[PDB]
Each structure stands twice: as structure tokens, then as C-alpha cells.
Amino acid sequence: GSKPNYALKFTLAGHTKAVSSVKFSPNGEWLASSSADKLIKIWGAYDGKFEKTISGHKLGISDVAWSSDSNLLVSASDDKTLKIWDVSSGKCLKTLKGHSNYVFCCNFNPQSNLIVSGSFDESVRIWDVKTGKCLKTLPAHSDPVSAVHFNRDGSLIVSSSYDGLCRIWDTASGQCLKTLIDDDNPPVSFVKFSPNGKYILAATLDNTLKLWDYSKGKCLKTYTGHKNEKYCIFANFSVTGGKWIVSGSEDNLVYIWNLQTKEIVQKLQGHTDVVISTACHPTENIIASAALENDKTIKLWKSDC
């Protein structure tokens, strides 16, 4: 349990351009991947078995997210839309139109009655899942929005931007509750709530990750050693074994840190391009990593701790 020993189990091939994101289904069954090749692909979490392709976006996809019940996907595309997909039928249920530029990031709230989106048009939008109508448009940032995430009860949204700010929003009213990172720069490339909704993990494009106390609005911890000057790279709370922070890197490696000691406890070697996206399995010690154009594969890693 002390230090993880993640080892390569499967390499998943199929995507013909850069992979943009990977996410495990909450029920642990599936990995979903999105790509610059305009496709979503579904894989078996435990054996990497290719299950299907999902098609309909007219341009590249930047993000994909799962509903609580593992039955829906939402995707964010350069075609300026989001799409809600029934995963079982592979059919597009709704197209979410309203953004005036690339949609970069998306997530379901835990109720999975709302979707939150971030765009190059510098706004965050909230969508009704059943009707696909836009409920609210938040003038959230003054540069592209890099990440959006709901907290554990869906009462708050956290957003991040190249404008160098991290903000938190009241879901119901869409009013700003606070501006957490108010620095002019470095650009905030990623943010998400901790599983308890108490902290916020934030990446800045100066090779730095930080853990913030949302309530107190102050930085508890700092993680470094990786390379992150250009890309919006996902980061994760690993909580099934040892308590880790997980991130990709522009040196083609996956970085794992001890959350408390801030020490590098593993570096995963295999990718041949920037590791843009990592995801942690909800019940087993498994990591999915995915990489850009020169590589285009997804790797599944497994650990005893």
C-alpha cells in the first residue's frame, strides 16, 4: 500500500489522430475515449477489448463525460456543439447549440439532469439534459475556458481559463461565489473538485499543480517535477489504494505523487507523445493514459497498491 507499482497491461489502438480525453464509467465497466478524429470509442476497462465507435460530430472532440448511471455520454467538439449519446444504442439523443466557438470541456452534475460546458467563446453554459435547451450562459472568463466540474452535491461549478483565473459558481443562480486564483497569469489549464468537494486541484502552465482549500481560499500543497507549459492536461485524485495525485506530462510520462508528502512515487514510461489525459478507475487500482498525434494510443496500467 506504501508506493504504487503500476505496470502496462494493454495498449488500445484505433484512433487516427490525437486522443483528447479518457474517462472510466462510474460502474467500472467501460473506458470512453474522445479524439481529434471526431470519434468516441468504448473499451473494456479490465481487458482493453474494443467495444464500439460512436459517430456524429463534424469536427474534432476535446472532451467526453459519463452520467451517474453509466447510460449517457456528453461530448464537446470544435463543431461548436455538445452531443448527448445513449451509450447502449450508440445514438445521438440531443445536440446542444449556443456556443459561438470550440467547446473544450464538459461534465454531468451528480443528479445528471444538467451538463456544464466550457468554450473558446469564454463562457460557461449549463444545459437541461432532458430537453437539450441552454438554461444559463455565464460570462465566466476573458479567454478560453480550459475546465469545468461540479462538486459532490452539484450545488457548485468550478471553472478555469487561460485568463489565469479559477472561479466557483452557484449552480442554481449561476452567480460567482468566489475567484480562487486571481493571478494575471500563469494560465489555469485544468481544475476539479476533490471527491469530498472540500479541495480544488488546479494546474497552471508553469509546470505546477496545487491543492486549494475551497472554503479558506488558500493553497495547501504544490506538486512539481513534470512538464506543463502548453497543454490542458487532466489531473486526478487516486483513492482506491494509496492516496495519489495523477497527471500526464509533455515529457511523454505519467506522474504519480503522494498527496500528503508531495513526493514523486511513480513515473510511467511507454507513451511516445504528450500524455494529455489520465483517469483513475472508481474501484480498482487501474489508470488509463492517452497521448497526442505521434502516439494516438491509450494505455491501461494496474497496481497492487
Ligand SMILES: CO[C@@H](CCc1nc(CO)c[nH]1)c1ccccc1
Ligand atoms: C491538444 O489539446 C487537447 C485538449 C484536451 C483537454 N484537456 C481538458 C481539460 O479540461 C479538456 N480537454 C485536444 C483537443 C482537441 C483534440 C485533441 C486534443
